[PDB]
């Protein structure tokens, strides 16, 4: 029922975020090879068995 909220602060956080750049990284393969890259990463040499398995831990 309120229809005239002020539009001044629009785009605030997007425009005042600090711009950083993407880091140049080596290319991860695509397709079949990438699934192979996942496969050893999960089943063959599964590294952290802290409790069970963590696909993305922090700085633990």
């Amino acid at each position: 029922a309120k229809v005239h909220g002020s539009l001044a602060r629009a785009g605030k956080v997007k425009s005042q975020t600090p711009k950083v750049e993407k880091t140049e990284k080596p290319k991860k393969p695509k397709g079949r090879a990438y699934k192979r890259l996942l496969y050893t990463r999960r089943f063959v040499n599964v590294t952290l068995v802290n409790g069970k398995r963590r696909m993305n831990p922090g700085p633990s």
Binding site: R32, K35, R36, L38, Y39, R42, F43
Partner: protein, 185 residues
Amino acid sequence: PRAPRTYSKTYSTPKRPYESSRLDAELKLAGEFGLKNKKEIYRISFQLSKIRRAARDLLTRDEKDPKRLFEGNALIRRLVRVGVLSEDKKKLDYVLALKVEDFLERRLQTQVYKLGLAKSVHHARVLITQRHIAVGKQIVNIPSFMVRLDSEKHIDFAPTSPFGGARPGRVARRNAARKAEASGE
């Protein structure tokens, strides 16, 4: 005003998109058999579902129904011929068995890994798709070729396309022509 050209979907994505058990079981298949997609497993699951529903449709009849005898013997011989169905297990209650790994074992990729000749399922996949191995004299570059019984004794390299003779190959040709340039004339 023509005749229509028919087609069909050959796969069916599962109903729950994220089950940890199914993702683990399908990455295990994709790593043991060297696949690209999960669609390369969903296609095999589609084949199993159609074969298996047809088998149930025959099992619900009585024995010595002529449709049961004809379609059962036909489906059994088609499953035996590609080596999916074993030789002792030949009676239509064994095609209701017969998991996905039995079809995923008989592809040209895995059979090229087994019969020497490839030393890896990834090397087998790349060997197949790079205009190597032939079955008859026919070069096949389809890693889901699904070899038969009477053709698995014919998987070998091409009469063209080196590792079968017939030329060195362009990186070997260039490395020779740069070996034949600096040292000599």
